[PDB]
Amino acid sequence: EVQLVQSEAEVKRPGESLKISCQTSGYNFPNYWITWVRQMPGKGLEWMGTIDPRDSDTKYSPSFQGQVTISADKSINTAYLQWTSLRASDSATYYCVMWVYITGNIWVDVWGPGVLVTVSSASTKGPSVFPLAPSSGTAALGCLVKDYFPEPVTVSWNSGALTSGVHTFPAVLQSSGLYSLSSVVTVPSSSLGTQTYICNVNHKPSNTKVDKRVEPKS
Amino acid sequence: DVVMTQSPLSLPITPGQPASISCRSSQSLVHNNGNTYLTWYQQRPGQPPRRLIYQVSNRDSGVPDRFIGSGAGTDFTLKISRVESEDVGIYYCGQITDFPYSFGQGTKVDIKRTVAAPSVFIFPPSDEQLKSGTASVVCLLNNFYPREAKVQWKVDNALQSGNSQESVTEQDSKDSTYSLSSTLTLSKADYEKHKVYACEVTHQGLSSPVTKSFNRGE
């Protein structure tokens, strides 16, 4: 089966350059094009441009021309998208898409896995974990995972054993340029005296593991 | 040159029922040879897009018969015959006839279920976070449907603006509900100069808005 391999997630600073890559795997012939598509979080798909690897002919969207360059290396079945000068607005997911054609308009359409590009002035920081303590049926408790960079953070409860009724919200970007999320769990109120609940927070870019026990306090 | 308009933006479907997604172009998509080359994509949550339909109605390999593409000229439709749990996600029409290429804005298909009111909980800031100099107060809205909701913050019976941030989970696989967090961020100083902290929640499944509150220090 044909498939595209994309380079790994990038964290960059405003003004730096960046080249991301896309490699065809398991397709022989040269009857294909490679196009790059941007998707902001929560937003739709945007065509950025298309390259014919055979002659390196390119077509650019008018909205991205002069911000990016598309290139191809047939010798290794790889295509590239590069910026000279990144901006925070370039924080998005970028897909390369292979269009295998028959001047014809009919092809087959293989998408890559996407790569997340984070452009920000923040530096790596591990989270502070705070308890969202249950109070005075069904009770709610949780952990606030505050002030970390970059994404992602993984959260589990009781080392993966507590799974149902768990809601880990997607993180939001604070004005500090740090991320913040919470994870909550609804539990039977009787269980709050008999049981123990610990959130396990993993932020691997800073090698931070935190286990915080959320207890009702008074 | 060509502008694609897609409707509706969101589409609640009862499982087993059909979904119809529309896509209109600002000029006829019929190429100079007499053929039309509109495509449709599906993006499952967290997944790359995959092409379903090309050339208006032809289906790509492996895509089931219940995806039916139709249309002519400027008016095109994707019909999903019997929407099931695996079809939740965003659908995009794709125009590659005329340069510049573009995608519709996307139609989010979710699962219709009976209205469920949010269960609301409020969390005061931990004393650990207060020693850090910042107070986060969290309002949790748990397991509601539909997605529309509004939360509003009041401090010492004074409405707040511009100091809160929201986050929403995607549709839960089991119960088809959403949950929402809103976080109110104050300085420690500001937090201690006030007494009662409350969040008000408005949702189709509530007859009147609900308020959860606490008194700092109680």
Numbering used by the authors:
A (entry chain A): 1 to 52, 52A, 53 to 82, 82A, 82B, 82C, 83 to 98, 100A, ...
B (entry chain B): 1 to 27, 27A, 27B, 27C, 27D, 27E, 28 to 213
Can I see the authors' text?
The HIV-1 envelope glycoprotein (Env) is the sole target for neutralizing antibody (NAb) responses. The development and structural determination of soluble native-like Env trimer mimics, particularly ones based on the SOSIP technology, has provided a platform for structure-based immunogen design. Here, we describe a detailed characterization of neutralizing and non-neutralizing mAbs isolated from two rhesus macaques (RMs) previously immunized with the BG505 SOSIP.664 trimer. We therefore selected three Fabs (RM20J, RM20F, and RM20E1) that bound to different epitopes for high-resolution structural determination.
We solved a 2.3 Å crystal structure of the unliganded RM20E1 Fab and 4.4 Å cryoEM structure of RM20E1 Fab bound to BG505 SOSIP trimer and Fab PGT122. Half of the rh2011 KC mAbs belonged to the RM20E clonal family, isolated from the week 53 sample. The RM20E clonal family utilized the HC V gene IGHV5-ABI*01_S2502 and the KC V gene LJI.Rh_IGKV2.71. RM20E1 binds to an epitope composed of one gp120 and two gp41 protomers with 1178 Å2 of BSA. Residues 515 to 520 of the FP in the primary gp41 protomer are sandwiched between CDR-H3, CDR-L1, and CDR-L3 of RM20E1. Despite recognition of the conserved FP, RM20E1 did not neutralize the autologous BG505.T332N pseudovirus. The antibody did however potently neutralize the N611A glycan KO BG505 pseudovirus suggesting the epitope is shielded by the N611 glycan. The RM20E1-bound FP conformation is similar to the FP conformation when bound by the bNAb VRC34; however, the inability of RM20E1 to accommodate the N611 glycan likely results in the lack of neutralization of the wild-type virus.
